[PDB]
Design a protein. Structure first.
Lengths: 51, 100, 50, 50, 309, 50, 217
């Protein structure tokens, strides 16, 4: 139902909980790196430039 | 419409059947967002059956998944049309040019 | 099952001999209906809407 | 790429530019000079640093 | 210790745009204001854009009306750009009727006390046949910002008029705002500057009104700036009585009897109901069945309905 | 020809102009090129990929 | 069509003279307009007084050396900008440095006048070499509504009036319930200590409101 209360709950379960991000030709171990999630409107993944 | 261009865009619109090109020249009798009826000129007209050329425009409809293919009349009530002129743009055609 | 049998018993719902196969809109996608078509096997009585 | 163009454009110096030659106590007031339109981003200047 | 500014000649040029000016400007304040005003000017201002349009025989915006060369989508699109202005009403429904071969402009609508058509020549659509007629209910409201038709459906709540085509909200007087601070030499002061704010508009808002409300919100935001688990009853009880899907007759009786929520209903008793107007044995029979179906009944006493916020 | 067509335009030959950040309202050092480029939407649209 | 004003405002202030304040939620776009303007006033126009001119007891010129001081005169001018001067209703005062010896002349080595208040007596002005090391002189202050450069005293000390040492405003996204994207505005500022950061802002934007008193309704 996407009740308004869950979004705040998602911010709780997300906080300290890394996710793995990976790109297509994984070559060195840096092809997979962990990040802390920040909730974002939109369907695209936002990725730190330095990485 | 392309603002900067080459000149093929006319050919692309017409040769692909997306647009609707006049079969014979004459004057437009009726213009609807639905159909277009052209009253043929006699030089182009065959003696029998007399005739008028009736163009049934395609309206909102399914593409090979999932786009929409829809025609808009580009001509106005009572307008001179010459054989081979765009009567209506299809999708991605503007006045006979190619607009992607 | 037993506890399911009790559940219908308290809330008094008659569990149907029929299951829901209905076609429903995919998650997240939203639009306007521009058309409906009905195809029928030759010999089954066409319903009202059709 | 963009970031390195920034820092290069940041620290680079032209020969003659607004604020050339003056002196400042420290970086705080250097930005204060820049943001205000008084001094050019690149001009040869003596400033006290720690 | 400082000098306050104030306006001066506001020069209208076309029905669309005009150049306002602001003299009494001190050192550098021309920028401090001019951008800050452009900011509030382009965005948050009051405006009235057409919203819901219900037309004659048209089921959805993707069809074609026989006798008109504009696809419905295009006619909807033309309306988003119809500029109007009201005075004392925050939403008005205008009735447009016309027929016969020729252009249907925006002046053909039916005038209202607050109706001001700023572009009477604005083309709604053409008409291609001798007898072909279009009647339309055009609902215009007033608001702020951009509200696309998409976000418009969340609330819902009986938007059932399948004939009502929503359009996207254009709300905004401002088109283009540009500011230039040229140095204004008032007869005596060291150096002071002017502000020439050349704006551009759809004709539904006057320059002074805009530039005033702009600064209005500005300081209004500085206001703040300047200083510095126990559910009790079953949640289903707070669902409205409409959720029971009763008979037309039965539903109206409850609203007529001050019974608006499920919690109110479970308290009332069988005896009381036959005494309320319009209800007989027939009507009551329907009610007893629907309640058992959700695990409820009539007449249950709750010593604490409802709690507590 | 482009420069000539830009001459009839009243617009500069550099094809660059002064542009101002809509945030601070301050100018941008250097002229930036502004113009009209034809741009396409390819159909990869993101609410397919997600 | 009523408007949006924010709620909860954490002020986490480092030490005293330094502060970083966040204010959220705003309406989209507003963090930047509020932020920038408040920055312009704070930087380029603020009431305050520091140093326009000081007579040189050693020489008559800005290019010269003293006896007993390794600091170049420009160095001492640097130090001069950094002296915190909060003057009472007295518009322009003048003080004296009287002191000498084997060690640096601090700001407690300055005469104490009636309407003068120095926030740091500790301030290091210039060192003092061995022996007697002849030094003292008279200092004249000045007021400004902005930052006044050296070349702007066209008829010499760059006059830094505005208590602001540094101003930055960071605009980040704010989340309110069903409101998708907003502005969360974080102002970080350092001060010279005369007026604390918290109130400089208050007044900084009070100036702003007063310029607008001619428009509201």
């Amino acid at each position: 139902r996407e009740e308004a209360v869950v979004w705040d709950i998602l911010d709780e379960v997300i906080r300290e909980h890394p996710v793995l991000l990976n790109r297509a030709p994984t070559l060195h171990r840096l092809g997979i790196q962990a990040f802390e999630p920040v909730l974002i409107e939109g369907k695209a993944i936002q990725l730190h430039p330095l990485v | 419409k392309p603002l900067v261009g080459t000149g093929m865009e006319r050919a692309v619109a017409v040769d692909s059947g997306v647009t609707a090109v006049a079969k014979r020249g004459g004057v437009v009798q009726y213009v609807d967002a639905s159909r277009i009826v052209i009253k043929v000129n006699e030089d182009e007209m065959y003696p029998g059956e007399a005739g008028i050329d009736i163009y049934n425009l395609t309206k909102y409809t399914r593409s090979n998944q999932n786009t929409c293919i829809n025609q808009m009349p580009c001509v106005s009530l009572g307008e001179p049309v010459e054989r081979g002129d765009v009567l209506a743009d299809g999708p991605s055609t503007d006045l006979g040019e190619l607009a992607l | 099952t037993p506890e399911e049998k009790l559940l219908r018993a308290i809330f008094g719902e008659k569990a149907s001999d029929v299951k829901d196969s209905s076609l429903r809109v995919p998650n997240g996608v939203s639009g306007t209906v521009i058309d409906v078509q009905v195809f029928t096997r030759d010999g089954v009585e066409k319903d009202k809407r059709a | 790429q963009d970031v390195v163009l920034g820092l290069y454009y940041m620290t680079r110096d032209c020969v003659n530019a607004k604020g050339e030659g003056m002196v400042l106590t420290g970086p705080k007031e250097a930005e204060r000079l820049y943001r205000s339109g008084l001094a050019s981003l690149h001009a040869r200047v003596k400033v006290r640093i720690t | 210790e400082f000098l306050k500014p104030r306006l001066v000649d506001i020069e209208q040029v076309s029905s669309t745009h005009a150049k306002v000016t602001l003299e009494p400007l001190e050192r550098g304040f021309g920028h401090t204001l001019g951008n800050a005003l452009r900011r509030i000017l382009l965005s948050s201002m009051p405006g009235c854009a057409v919203t819901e349009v219900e037309i004659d025989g048209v089921l959805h915006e993707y069809s074609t009306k026989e006798g008109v060369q504009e696809d419905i989508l295009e006619i909807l699109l033309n309306l988003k750009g119809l500029a109007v202005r009201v005075q004392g009403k925050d939403e008005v429904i205008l009735t447009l009727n016309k027929s016969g071969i020729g252009p249907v402009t925006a002046a053909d609508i039916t005038h209202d006390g607050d109706v001001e058509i700023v572009k009477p020549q604005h083309v709604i659509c053409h008409l291609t046949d001798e007898n072909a007629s279009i009647s339309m209910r055009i609902k215009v409201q007033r608001g702020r910002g951009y509200v696309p038709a998409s976000t418009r459906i969340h609330s819902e709540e009986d938007e059932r008029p399948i004939g009502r085509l929503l359009v996207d909200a254009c709300y905004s007087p401002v088109e283009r705002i540009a500011y230039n601070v040229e140095a204004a030499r008032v007869e005596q002061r060291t150096d002071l500057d002017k502000l020439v704010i050349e704006m551009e508009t759809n004709g539904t808002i006057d320059p002074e009104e805009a530039i005033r409300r702009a600064a209005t919100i500005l300081a209004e935001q500085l206001e703040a700036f300047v200083d510095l688990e126990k559910p009790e009853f079953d949640p289903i009880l707070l669902r409205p009585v409409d959720d029971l899907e009763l008979t037309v007759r039965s539903a109206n009786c409850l609203k007529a009897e001050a019974i608006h929520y499920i919690g109110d209903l479970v308290q009332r008793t069988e005896v009381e109901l036959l005494k309320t107007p319009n209800l007989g044995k027939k009507s009551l029979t329907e009610i007893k069945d629907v309640l058992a179906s959700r695990g409820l009944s009539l007449g249950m006493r709750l010593e604490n309905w409802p709690p507590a916020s | 020809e482009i420069k000539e067509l830009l001459k009839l335009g009243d617009l500069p030959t550099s094809g660059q102009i002064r542009l101002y950040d809509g945030r601070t309202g301050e100018q941008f050092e250097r002229p930036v090129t502004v113009g009209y480029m034809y741009m396409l939407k390819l159909n990869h649209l993101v609410d397919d990929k997600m």
